[PDB]
C-alpha cells in the first residue's frame, strides 16, 4: 500500500565514484524509513479586491497589502516576498477568485467573478466563470505528509540540500548530522 | 532580534505581539519582549569534541568576512 | 613641531600628566620630573614659552 | 588570522582581501531609501549601481541561522 | 475626605507600522491599474 | 503540441499615457501604454498594461525596432 | 630540544588520494629544514589609567586623551582618529 | 611611494618622519626619506622556460592579482 516506503535496488548500484559502499548502503537503509509529520494550516478563499505592491528601485525589497473579500467579511493582509512572487506569477487582476494555503504558500486561481468590460489587448483572463465564495474567509485544517529520513539528512546537510535531493550530489554526509537528526 | 557579539550572527525571533496578530499571510510566530536589559552577558555550558574544532578550523564558517 | 625632552634636550617620548613636562625615559621621570619642587616646572616651560 | 609585526601594508591588504567591497556588496543589498537617494536625488542611473542581491535564498526562515 | 477615599477606594491591538519610503507602487483597482514610478 | 498567441512587428508609437489623478510623492504615474505595431500588409494599435513599460525600458526598446 | 624541526611520519601515511607518493615524500623532506630569522619590533605594554573621548554629532572629528602608565612611569597621549577607531573597537 | 615606470605598479611604504609629530599616538608607520636620487634605471636579464609561458596562459580559473 501507499505511505510505506519500498526501496528496491539491484546489487551493482552500490559501487560508485562519488560515494563509498558504506555510505551508499547507509543511504539505501535510510531511504526506507518514513517520518509522518502532522501540520496545521489555514485556507483562505475569497474574491480579490485590492492589491498594492511596493517595490524598491532595483526590485529587491518587495512588500505590500492585499484587500480580499467574500460575501460576508473584508480583510486586509500584509504580504511577504514569497507571496508577492506567487502573485506576480500567473497574474491576478483585482476581481478574480483565488485560494490561499498558509503553510504551503500555494497560489491557485479558481477563476473570475467580476466580468470586467474594459480589458487591455494583452493579458485576458478567459478564466471559467465562478461564483464568489460565501461564509468564513479563514478555515483551519490539520494536514499530514510523509518525508524520508534520507531527505531530512540531505536537507540539513548543507545550504542547498533540496537541489541535492534531485541532482544526487550528496557526498559523504557526516555522522554528527545523522546523530542530531536521530535525536530530533 | 538577537545579536551575538562573539561572531556577529543575528537571529530573527519573529514579530512582537504588541501589535496585531491575525493580519499576516506568512505563517509567522509571535514572541513577547525579552526580559532584562538589552545588553547581556550570559554563561552557556557547551559539550564538544576535538574533531569538531578540527573541521571548524579546516573549513572556516562563522565569521562575517568574505 | 618636533617634541624634545625638557630636562636633557633629547627626543621626548612621554609627557607627565601633572606638570606637563616632556621627558625622555623612566629614570629621568623618577629622578627629576617626579620629585621636583613647584615653581620649577613653570621655569622649565618658560624656555619654550608654554606657561 | 595571519599577522606580520611592523608593517601596515600587510594589514591593509588583509583587510582588503577579507572585506572586498565588490564581493561584499554582491552578497547583500542596498537599503531602499539609500537607493532613492542615489537615483533621484543624485542623478545616478539604475545601470550604474553596483550589482547586489546575489546571495542564495535559504529553504525556510528557520534555516537562515544557526541560533 | 481622606478617610472616605482610603476606605472606599484603597481593546483592539494596533496594526504594525507600514513604511514604504522612496519605493515604487503598483495599484490594481476594479476599473483601472496604476504604476507609480520615479 | 501547443498554441502561441503573438503580436510582432515594427513599433510605430510608444506612449505611456498618464493617469487622471497622479499620486503625490511620485512621478509619471501610468494608466496604460499605447503601442502601435506595423508588419507586412497590416498595422494595429494596442492597449497594454502599465507593468510592461518596465520591461520595455529594461529591454531598451526604442522607436523603429521590431 | 625545541626550535629544531623533527618530522615523525609512518610508512603508510604517503599513499594519498590527492597527492602522489613522491610529492608527499618531498613535502615530508622539506618540512624538516628551517630558516632562522631574527627581527626587532617596538611595543607599548601598559596599564590604562584614563581614556577621554570627545565626539561630534556626525562623527567627523574625534579627539582623544589617553593617560597610561606602568609601575615605573606615567604619561598622557594625544590620539588621532584611527587610534580612536582602534580603541572603540575592542573596547578598552 | 614606489612607482615602476614600465609596469605601472604602485607600492606604498608609509608616512614620513617629518609628519611623525602630528599626533602623540598614530597607527601609521614612519619611514625616513630615501637617500639616493628619485629616478633609478637598471638593466636586467630575464630567464623564462617554455613551460612558464605555457602555464601563464593555461590558467583554467583565470588570472590572479599581484
Swiss-Prot record, chain C:
Annotated disulfide bonds: none
Signal peptide interval: none
Subcellular location: Nucleus
Quaternary state and interactors: Component of the chromatin-remodeling INO80 complex, at least composed of ARP4, ARP5, ARP8, RVB1, RVB2, TAF14, NHP10, IES1, IES3, IES4, IES6, ACT1, IES2, IES5 and INO80.
Family, similarity comment: Belongs to the IES6 family.
Function comment: Probably involved in transcription regulation via its interaction with the INO80 complex, a chromatin remodeling complex. Also involved in the regulation of telomere length.
Other notes: Present with 1720 molecules/cell in log phase SD medium.
Protein name (database record): Chromatin-remodeling complex subunit IES6
The species this protein was found in: Saccharomyces cerevisiae (strain ATCC 204508 / S288c)
Gene of this entry: IES6
Whole-protein coverage range: 112 to 162 of 166
From Swiss-Prot, chain D:
Subcellular location: Nucleus
Domain of life of the source: Eukaryota
Subunit structure: Component of the chromatin-remodeling INO80 complex, at least composed of ARP4, ARP5, ARP8, RVB1, RVB2, TAF14, NHP10, IES1, IES3, IES4, IES6, ACT1, IES2, IES5 and INO80.
Job description of the protein: ATPase component of the INO80 complex which remodels chromatin by shifting nucleosomes and is involved in DNA repair. Its ability to induce transcription of some phosphate-responsive genes is modulated by inositol polyphosphates. The INO80 complex is involved in DNA repair by associating with 'Ser-129' phosphorylated H2A histones as a response to DNA damage.
Protein species of origin: Saccharomyces cerevisiae (strain ATCC 204508 / S288c) (Baker's yeast)
Protein name: Chromatin-remodeling ATPase INO80
Coiled coil: none
Free-text note on domains in this protein's UniProt record: The DBINO region is involved in binding to DNA.
Boundaries of the shown chain within the full protein: 1220 to 1286 of 1489
Note, other: Present with 1110 molecules/cell in log phase SD medium.
Family: Belongs to the SNF2/RAD54 helicase family.
Curated annotation (Swiss-Prot), chain E:
Location relative to the cell: Nucleus
Function: Component of the INO80 complex which remodels chromatin by shifting nucleosomes and is involved in DNA repair.
Basic residues composition-biased segments: 1-10
The protein, known as: Ino eighty subunit 2
Subunit structure: Component of the chromatin-remodeling INO80 complex, at least composed of ARP4, ARP5, ARP8, RVB1, RVB2, TAF14, NHP10, IES1, IES3, IES4, IES6, ACT1, IES2, IES5 and INO80.
From-to range in the entire protein, with total length: 268 to 320 of 320
Any further remark recorded for this protein: Present with 1470 molecules/cell in log phase SD medium.
Record family assignment: Belongs to the IES2 family.
Cystine residue pairs: none
From Swiss-Prot, chain G:
Cellular localisation: Nucleus, Nucleoplasm
Highest taxon above the source species: Eukaryota
Something else known: Present with 3030 molecules/cell in log phase SD medium.
Organism placement in taxonomy: Eukaryota, Fungi, Dikarya, Ascomycota, Saccharomycotina
Similarity section: Belongs to the RuvB family.
Subunit details: Probably forms a homohexamer. Interacts with RVB1 and may form heterododecamers with RVB1. Component of the SWR1 chromatin remodeling complex composed of at least ACT1, ARP4, RVB1, RVB2, ARP6, YAF9, VPS71, VPS72, SWC3, SWC4, SWC5, SWC7 and SWR1, and perhaps BDF1. Component of the chromatin-remodeling INO80 complex, at least composed of ARP4, ARP5, ARP8, RVB1, RVB2, TAF14, NHP10, IES1, IES3, IES4, IES6, ACT1, IES2, IES5 and INO80. Also belongs to the R2TP complex composed of at least RVB1, RVB2, TAH1 and PIH1. Interacts with SPT15/TBP.
Organism: Saccharomyces cerevisiae (strain ATCC 204508 / S288c) (Baker's yeast)
Name used for this protein in its record: RuvB-like protein 2
